[PDB]
C-alpha cells in the first residue's frame, strides 16, 4: 500500500475537495466523525482505502488532504461543516487577503509569504506515509490563488518530492459562472509554469458541467453545489482504482503509463454517463452498450470538443456497477462500426477496461439519481486542444491592447512572462496539431 496526498488550492479546489471527501466517506462507509465500522484493523492497516485515509488509535479515519486558501472564508466552512471532525486543524491553511483574481498576486506577492508554511504542513502528512506515490492537486485556472499559488506549490513539490508523481484536477473557466475578466490570463500563466511539473491533468470546463446540469438534471440555474456534486462523481470514478481493490490504474504512475505517451500532452478528456435527475422517480436504466455509446457524445464530455476531428493516443473505460466484460466487448464492437475513432499510427487501437462492482454512490438528497451502472471514459484525444485554442484567442485579444497587464506588473511580475507563457501555449497547440492532423 502506498499513500496519496490530496491538495486543494483556492475556493474551487477547496469546495470541490469538500464534495469529494464527502463522497469518499459515503463510498467507504466512513461516518462524519471519522469512525469506520467495517474497518476491523483499529488504528492501522494497509488496505486500499488507507491510501487516502490515515487511522488514529481511537479509530478515526483522517483524510490525507491539505486545504489551502489565501482567504479564510471558504475553509472556515469545512472547519464547521458536517465533516469537521474528519480533518485536524493542521490540515486547514488560510490567509487573510486573497490574490484578487491576480496570478501575480497569488504566485509572487502573497504566495511567497505562505509557501513555506504549506510545505511544512504537507511534510507532516508525508512523514505518516510508508511509501508516498505522489499528490493530487485541485484548483481553478481562473482564480488568483488557484492559478498563482498552485504553480508556485507545484514547483516546490518537484524540488522536495522529485520522485513523486503529481496529478491535477483543473477547473477551466466559463463565463456563465466566471468571476473575473482576466481568467484567460491566469489560465495561460499557470499552465505555462505548471506544464513541466504535472504528470497528468484532468481539465473540467465549467461550461460543460453547467450545461449537463441544465440538460440532464433539469437545473435551471446550476450553482457551485450542483456543479461540485457532479464533478466529485467524475473525480471518484478516476480515483476509485486507487481506493478499491483492482488491477487497473492501481498507482499514480500507471495513470501516466496508460494515458500519457507524450509528457507535454498530458490532458485526458473525461466523459461520464449516465447523468439522471433524481426528480425522475422511475427512469429506464441504461444498458452497458447505451452508457458506453454515450461516452462518445460531446454532450457528456467534461470539455466540449469534437474527438471525431482528432486522434486518440489512449483510452480507458472505468465502469461502476452491474457490468461484465462480455457486455463491454459487445458494446465496443458495435461502437467501432458506427463511430469515428481514429488512433495515432504509433499506438494500438484498443481500450483498457476497469470494472468495479459497487454501483456509483449518490449523496442523499442530491440531484443525481441512483443508477445500476455507470462509466467514465478517459481518452487522450487531440481534440481537447480546442480548449487551448479558445483560451489562447481570448488571451491574444486582451494582450494586444495590454488590457489589465498593469495589475500583474504591479505585483512584481515582468511583462515578458506574458509573451513567454503565450509562446509556450503556441508550441503546445502546435504539438497537438502535429499529432492529430495529417
Amino acid at each position: 500500500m502506498r499513500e496519496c496526498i490530496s491538495i486543494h488550492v483556492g475556493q474551487a479546489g477547496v469546495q470541490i475537495g469538500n464534495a469529494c471527501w464527502e463522497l469518499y466517506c459515503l463510498e467507504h462507509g466512513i461516518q462524519p466523525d471519522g469512525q469506520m465500522p467495517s474497518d476491523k484493523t483499529i488504528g492501522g492497516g494497509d488496505d486500499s482505502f488507507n491510501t487516502f485515509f490515515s487511522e488514529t488509535g481511537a479509530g478515526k479515519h483522517v483524510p490525507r488532504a491539505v486545504f489551502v486558501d489565501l482567504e479564510p472564508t471558504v475553509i472556515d466552512e469545512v472547519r464547521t461543516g458536517t465533516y469537521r471532525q474528519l480533518f485536524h486543524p493542521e490540515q486547514l491553511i488560510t490567509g487573510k487577503e486573497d490574490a484578487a483574481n491576480n496570478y501575480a498576486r497569488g504566485h509572487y506577492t502573497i504566495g511567497k509569504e505562505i509557501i513555506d508554511l504549506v510545505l511544512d504542513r504537507i511534510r507532516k502528512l508525508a512523514d505518516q506515509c510508508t511509501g508516498l506515490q505522489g499528490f493530487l492537486v485541485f484548483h481553478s485556472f481562473g482564480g488568483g490563488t488557484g492559478s498563482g499559488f498552485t504553480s508556485l506549490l507545484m514547483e516546490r513539490l518537484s524540488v522536495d518530492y522529485g520522485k513523486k508523481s503529481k496529478l491535477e484536477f483543473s477547473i477551466y473557466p466559463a463565463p456563465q459562472v466566471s468571476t473575473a475578466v482576466v481568467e484567460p490570463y491566469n489560465s495561460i500563466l499557470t499552465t505555462h509554469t505548471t506544464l513541466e511539473h504535472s504528470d497528468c491533468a484532468f481539465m473540467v470546463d465549467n461550461e460543460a458541467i453547467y450545461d449537463i446540469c441544465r440538460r440532464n438534471l433539469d437545473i435551471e440555474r446550476p450553482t457551485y453545489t450542483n456543479l461540485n456534486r457532479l464533478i466529485s462523481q467524475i473525480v471518484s470514478s478516476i480515483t476509485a482504482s486507487l481506493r478499491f481493490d483492482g488491477a487497473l490504474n492501481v498507482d499514480l504512475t500507471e495513470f501516466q503509463t496508460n494515458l500519457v505517451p507524450y509528457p507535454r500532452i498530458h490532458f485526458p478528456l473525461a466523459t461520464y454517463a449516465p447523468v439522471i435527475s433524481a426528480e425522475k422517480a422511475y427512469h429506464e436504466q441504461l444498458s452497458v452498450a447505451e452508457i458506453t455509446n454515450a461516452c462518445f457524445e460531446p454532450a457528456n464530455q467534461m470539455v466540449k470538443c469534437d474527438p471525431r476531428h482528432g486522434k486518440y493516443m489512449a483510452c480507458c473505460l472505468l465502469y461502476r456497477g452491474d457490468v461484465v466484460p462480455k457486455d463491454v466487448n459487445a458494446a465496443i464492437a458495435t461502437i467501432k462500426t458506427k463511430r469515428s475513432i481514429q488512433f495515432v499510427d504509433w499506438c494500438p487501437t484498443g481500450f483498457k477496461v476497469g470494472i468495479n462492482y459497487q454501483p456509483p454512490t449518490v449523496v442523499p438528497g442530491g440531484d443525481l439519481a441512483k443508477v445500476q451502472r455507470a462509466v467514465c471514459m478517459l481518452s487522450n484525444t487531440t481534440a481537447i486542444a480546442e480548449a487551448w485554442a479558445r483560451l489562447d484567442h481570448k488571451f491574444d485579444l486582451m494582450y494586444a491592447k495590454r488590457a489589465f497587464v498593469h495589475w500583474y506588473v504591479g505585483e512584481g511580475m515582468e511583462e515578458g512572462e506574458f509573451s513567454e507563457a503565450r509562446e509556450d501555449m503556441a508550441a503546445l497547440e502546435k504539438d497537438y496539431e502535429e499529432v492529430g492532423v495529417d
Binding site: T109, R156, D245, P325, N329, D345, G350, K352
Partner: protein, 54 residues
C-alpha cells in the same frame, strides 16, 4: 478483437481489448525569481513614495 490481461477480484475485474495493432528548476533558482519579483515591487513603491515626497 482480443481480450488480454483479465484480472478478477471480489470487488470487480479489469482487462484490455485490442482492436488493431499499431502501424526542473532548483530551489535556488526558484528563490531568485521570487526575490527578483519582490525587489521590483520595492523599486516601484519607492518611486511612488519619491513622487509623493516631491
Amino acid at each position: 478483437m482480443e481480450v488480454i490481461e483479465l484480472n478478477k477480484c471480489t470487488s470487480g475485474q479489469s482487462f484490455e481489448v485490442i482492436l488493431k495493432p499499431p502501424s526542473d528548476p532548483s530551489l535556488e533558482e526558484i528563490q531568485k525569481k521570487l526575490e527578483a519579483a519582490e525587489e521590483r515591487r520595492k523599486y516601484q513603491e519607492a518611486e511612488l513614495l519619491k513622487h509623493l515626497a516631491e
